[PDB]
Amino acid sequence: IVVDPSSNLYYRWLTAIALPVFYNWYLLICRACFDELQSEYLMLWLVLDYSADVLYVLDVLVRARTGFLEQGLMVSDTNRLWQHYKTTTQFKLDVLSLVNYPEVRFNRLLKFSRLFEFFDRTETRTNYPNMFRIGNLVLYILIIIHWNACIYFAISKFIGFGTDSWVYPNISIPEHGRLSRKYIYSLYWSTLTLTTIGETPPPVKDEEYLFVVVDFLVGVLIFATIVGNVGSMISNMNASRAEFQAKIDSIKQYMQFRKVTKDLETRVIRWFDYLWANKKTVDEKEVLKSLPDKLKAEIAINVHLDTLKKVRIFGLLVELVLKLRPTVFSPGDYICKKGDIGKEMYIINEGKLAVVADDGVTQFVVLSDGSYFGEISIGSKSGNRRTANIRSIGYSDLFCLSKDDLMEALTEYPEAKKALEEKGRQILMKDN
């Protein structure tokens, strides 16, 4: 057997090893600082520690018998795999890890790297990354508050219960002799100390003074860090929406400075409402330039042939959809007025447009998702211009394309070259 780190089996094993490391950190500092859960029910810690021990040695076997990506290929030679694993600090920590019995159980905490690999893999893999970031920083403040609650109960056990007012009170009293009372009061003191709140009892000895000073300074820096990253995450949750409202506000400030007319004001605001409520508010040319060009062209052929498998006369478009550049035209706008110069051609995708001749009247035909706008402008007594009025009837999208770009993508297709020139000359034959 051999497995790669991209495998869904490997992610499922990262889940099943993310369970007992989290168990071991949380309940092992709770056991080794409380010394009442053990003496109440040892047997659950026997069966859970046996399960965590066999999952740790199975993680040693799976981290032995997984492979990597050397020279672009996965590696299956198991003796060199064992030598590569044996020269690694992760296996060094694992044989320092796998040497009842809460001291060697406390030695079984050193496999945190599986939990960090779980957090990366889930942070990339999920479709609720924000859920994950809210969930793992809530997990980090609960582990910090739990370890500080158990450190407080160990300091109170080292001083003595109820010797003075700072420590836990006397456990001969049956109200302070419940394990639920011990854990939730030490958690409440840990919350009051770590979140810098106050209304604790005031300390009256020197180790209590040094510990409350160290705990308040760790409380300020841990409060700042972990409950400032939650502020950065919950204010980076709406980020592209914040950039879109930034674009809206900036355009509205420029229009309220420049004293523009009210119909243009509400047309621009309704264009912004169209781009918000139609969910097309992501600018793909700016946020999708950092991808490499091959996967950029692969997602281009995928989504553009999924929208555009309604191809005209010439099937196989692997070179013609390279530089499709969409633009959204508002309803009531004219694509080209009656007699203008022509540079670029427009194809229709998910739009419904129509032809005019006197700007509003003379609808000859409505237009489906088939053909071009600028098959003429690219002898027949004509050339290099458009002679048809095309008003945008609805909220359409239309790709634009360049003549030199289609010519240099057309040098491999002479059949499409002669088909395009023949259908443009045939359109001039039915027009002039």
Ligand X SMILES: Nc1nc2c(ncn2[C@@H]2O[C@@H]3COP(=O)(O)O[C@H]3[C@H]2O)c(=O)[nH]1
Ligand Y SMILES: *[C@@H]1O[C@H](CO)[C@@H](O)[C@H](O)[C@H]1NC(C)=O
Q: Which residues pair with 336 in a beta bridge?
A: 390
1 sits near ligand X (criterion: CB under 6 A):
no
Token digits of residue 20:
């007992």
139 sits near another protein (criterion: CB under 8 A):
no
162 sits near ligand Y (criterion: CB under 6 A):
yes
Tell which positions 336-355 bind ligand X, by CB under 6 A. 336, 342, 355
312 sits near a second copy (criterion: CB under 8 A):
no
Residue 307 labeled ligand binder: no
Shortest distance in whole angstroms from residue 115 CB to another protein: 17
Shortest distance in whole angstroms from residue 57 CB to a second copy: 25
Residue 375 labeled ligand binder: yes
161 sits near ligand Y (criterion: CB under 6 A):
yes
Calculate ∠ Cα 217-218-220, nearest 5°.
65
Calculate ∠ Cα 212-213-216, nearest 5°.
80
- Residue of the chain from 284, 359, 421, 431 that contacts another protein (CB under 8 A): 284
Token digits of residue 237:
């949750």
Cβ contact 242:250 at 8 Å: no
For residue 166, give the nearest of 213, 219, 220, 218 by alpha carbon.
213
d(Cα 359, Cα 408) in Å, to the nearest integer?
A: 35
d(Cα 114, Cα 107) in Å, to the nearest integer?
A: 16
- Residue of the chain from 90, 170, 225, 426 that contacts another protein (CB under 8 A): 225
Binder of residue 336, out of ligand Y, another protein, ligand X, none (CB less than 5 to 8 A by kind): ligand X
d(Cα 171, Cα 219) in Å, to the nearest integer?
A: 28
Q: Which is nearer to ligand Y, 143 or 171 (CB)?
A: 171
String of contacts with a second copy for each residue 50-69, x by CB under 8 A: -------------------x
For residue 420, give the nearest of 374, 384, 366 by alpha carbon.
374
Burial 91-123 (b: 16+ CB within 10 A, else e): beebeebbeeebeebeebeebeebbebbbebbe
124 sits near a second copy (criterion: CB under 8 A):
yes
Q: Which is nearer to a second copy, 57 or 207 (CB)?
A: 207
Residue 386 labeled ligand binder: yes
Q: Which residues bind ligand X (CB under 6 A)?
A: 336, 342, 355, 364-365, 372-377, 386-388, 390, 423-424, 426-427, 431
Q: Which residues bind ligand Y (CB under 6 A)?
A: 160-163, 170, 172
